[PDB]
Amino acid sequence: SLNSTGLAQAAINGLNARFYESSNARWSSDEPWWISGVALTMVIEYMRRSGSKEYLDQVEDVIEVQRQPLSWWPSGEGEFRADATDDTGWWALAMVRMYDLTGNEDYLNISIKDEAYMRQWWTDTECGGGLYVDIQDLTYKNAIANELYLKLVASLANRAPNATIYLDRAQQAWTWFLGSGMINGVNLINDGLARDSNTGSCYNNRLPVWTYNQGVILGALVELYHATKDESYLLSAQAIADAVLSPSNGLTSSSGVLTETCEGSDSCNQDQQVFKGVFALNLAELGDAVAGASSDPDAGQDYREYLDTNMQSMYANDRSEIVPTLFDSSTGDLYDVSWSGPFRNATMPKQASAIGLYVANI
């Protein structure tokens, strides 16, 4: 009885009414730039899944301005090539989705330039593989930058003309990730890798399990399945998603609600506020891939029910409607960080995460 399409549109309208900067073609310049990339993904994915085009003009504006050489990383020469590889990876994946929505080769070309830029910081000398996140420093190979890269090459393996070298890169990247140790004993992914002071060998740094690091990897494996038709990639994704859904692992509350590890102590920073929606969108991708790979009508039904359950809780306990004024008649919905906890304030990363959950149920 809940209309996820209308709620996503209200959530996007709330996102624009409070956080979109027309003069900058960006959401919230006081927030991390990469989260504007995530927001762009959610808006593109809303249009892709709902069949609507109401934000297409706005998305094109954002792309055209955020394409330009970044003032804080001119040496990237624009096209979203930034001072960290994960920043680049978020926009690169948004361009994959833009290409999926529009069929405009221009966006596919951006993702291709991004893949080649990110790969510059893949090294086999440390950790036997993987890329660094901090381009200027080269001190950290983490989960998210390698999950983004892996989903990027796996996506390009299904879309780019030289799809073979991208499929080989994806298969090689997944083999490295699987062997990295970052996937722990309960099939959840810790934050990144530490390096042995004496031996130089790398190991799971046991930093927190963040929801978005259980998400991007699902989309990556889904694209690897589409590229190979090997259901082993789906089964591996399902083991990771199942671990998230199991309340015994602390990511899913006793009410069945996705919960970031920082929500308990009310310490979720500007980055962590956006994590849950990224997982939700990728989980919906996994659900679609699972239901299409088997003739069982109940295939992937647990993931849909999970997303549905999480939507209603967010719908009921985390929502606050904007009240219009005599000057601003904007209507929409605002959302806080906890999908079960109360609504206290809204921020752009919280709102972006909100849209992702609604879009995940379209």
Ligand X SMILES: OC[C@H]1O[C@@H](O[C@@H]2[C@@H](O)[C@H](O)O[C@H](CO)[C@H]2O)[C@H](O)[C@@H](O)[C@@H]1O
CB 184 within 8 A of CB 204: yes
| CA gap 43, 45 in Å, rounded | 5
Enumerate residues 6+ apart whose C-beta is below 8 A from 108: 95, 96, 99, 159, 160
- Residue placing its CB nearer to ligand BGC in the complex, 78 or 181: 181
H-helix or E-strand spanning residue 48: helix 33-50
Least Cβ distance, residue 101 to ligand X (angstroms):
25
- Residue placing its CB nearer to ligand BGC in the complex, 205 or 259: 205
Enumerate residues 6+ apart whose C-beta is below 8 A from 185: none
Q: Is 315 in the site for ligand BGC (CB under 6 A)?
A: no
String marking each residue 248-277 x if it binds ligand X according to CB under 6 A: -----------------------xx-----
The interface region with ligand X, picked from 9-17, 28-36, 39-47, 298-306 by CB under 6 A, is 28-36
Residues in 267-296 that interact with ligand BGC by CB under 6 A: 284, 287-288
Least Cβ distance, residue 322 to ligand X (angstroms):
24
Least Cβ distance, residue 143 to ligand X (angstroms):
6
Least Cβ distance, residue 290 to ligand X (angstroms):
26
- Residue placing its CB nearer to ligand X in the complex, 95 or 101: 95
- Count the neighbouring beta carbons within 10 Å of the beta carbon of residue 48: 17
Backbone torsions φ then ψ of 21, nearest 5 degrees = -105, 105
- Residue placing its CB nearer to ligand BGC in the complex, 95 or 307: 307
Among 72, 75, 196, 326, binds ligand X (CB under 6 A): 72
Backbone torsions φ then ψ of 122, nearest 5 degrees = -80, 125
Residues in 138-177 that interact with ligand BGC by CB under 6 A: 139-140
Q: Is 76 in the site for ligand BGC (CB under 6 A)?
A: no
Least Cβ distance, residue 262 to ligand BGC (angstroms):
15
Relative orientation angle of helices 33-50 and 4-19, to the nearest 10 degrees:
150
H-helix or E-strand spanning residue 164: helix 163-180
| CA gap 322, 10 in Å, rounded | 10
Q: Is 142 in the site for ligand X (CB under 6 A)?
A: yes
